[PDB]
Amino acid sequence: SNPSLVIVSPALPGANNGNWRTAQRWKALLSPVCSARVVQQWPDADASADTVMLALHARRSAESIAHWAHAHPGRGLGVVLTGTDLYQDIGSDPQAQRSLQLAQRLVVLQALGAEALPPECRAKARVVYQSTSARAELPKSARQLRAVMVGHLRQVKSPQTLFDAARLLCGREDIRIDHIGDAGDAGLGELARALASDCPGYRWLGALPHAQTRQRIQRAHVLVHTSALEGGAHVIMEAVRSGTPVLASRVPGNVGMLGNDYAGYFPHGDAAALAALLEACRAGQRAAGLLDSLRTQCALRAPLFDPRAEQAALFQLLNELQ
Ligand SMILES: CC(=O)N[C@H]1[C@@H](OP(=O)(O)OP(=O)(O)OC[C@H]2O[C@@H](n3ccc(=O)[nH]c3=O)[C@H](O)[C@@H]2O)O[C@H](CO)[C@@H](O)[C@@H]1O
């Protein structure tokens, strides 16, 4: 019969974040060829019928990955490198390192991912670009530039780069920055609140439901993403597949999503560089404007994030694991 797949996600069930989104999307995409379930840890009371595991995060799921590898030595294990593992933990973390060794297949979420893996792990590495539904590209007003950034506030999102750019632009009534995401890591929420009180063109909206967040991404002239690292960020896909161009920090996770030739990168942590891009976007608002050049480049990336493509890549992965 068809495989019994268990997806391990460290997200809380129903959480509005990437780790929950991937796991629930992979379950939907794989459902026509297998019996699929999502858990936070393995084993559980239903563990005896599972034949394949896809485990997100080499460190956060290392305990379930180890359980699987001990119960199924050399068979049925895929480890998904969701970001903070690939670009932080696998360097020094012995649990992350063991997960890498035990996996039958490693999944990276964009083309550059395997460059961060040990060379001995590259033969068993598999690229699975993520997917999102498209939204109609909307005509937008030339009267103002409205940027949006989306990420639950934590240090890896480097939200200070956005706060520092919003400060450089404090006086520009013709440039608006909306920031969507909960106040997680200590004091980042306080920084956003203080900035919003000083610089009215900057608004921190807190966490928003995914529906409303996709509507905000679709309506913004540009999405800004400042991260220190990303596995391959859902928010960048969401923008691209809405016809909303991106300004992103030049880090491998972002480069993997937007392309080596993309004209909308700033150096990581360079607030002045990001504020200069926002000024260019605004100056451009006929054709030849930076926003138009970036929408052209993003439109060439949009077919990467087709759910039919992700599904075909997952079908191949599952065939390799059973
Ligand atoms: C730092 C890092 O490596 N991040 C990874 C993390 O996702 P992480 O959760 O950090 O970030 P993503 O951008 O990929 O996912 C956030 C998701 O939550 C939604 N959202 C967020 C905040 C908010 O207030 N409202 C809202 O709806 C966004 O629209 C998006 O769908 O795991 C994902 C895979 O599992 C990877 O794709 C990401 O690269």
Numbering used by the authors: 2 to 286, 291 to 327
Question: What do the authors of the reporting publication say about this deposited model?
Answer:
A specific SEN biosynthetic pathway was identified in Variovorax paradoxus DSM 30034, which is recognized as a way to incorporate Se into organic matter in bacteria. The bacterial SEN biosynthesis gene cluster encodes three proteins, SenA, SenB, and SenC. SenB catalyzes the generation of the key intermediate selenoglucose product using SeP synthesized by selenophosphate synthetase (named SelD or SenC)15. In contrast to other types of GTs, SenB performs dual functions in two-step catalytic reactions, catalyzing the formation of C–Se glycosidic bonds and the subsequent cleavage of Se-P bonds to generate the final product.
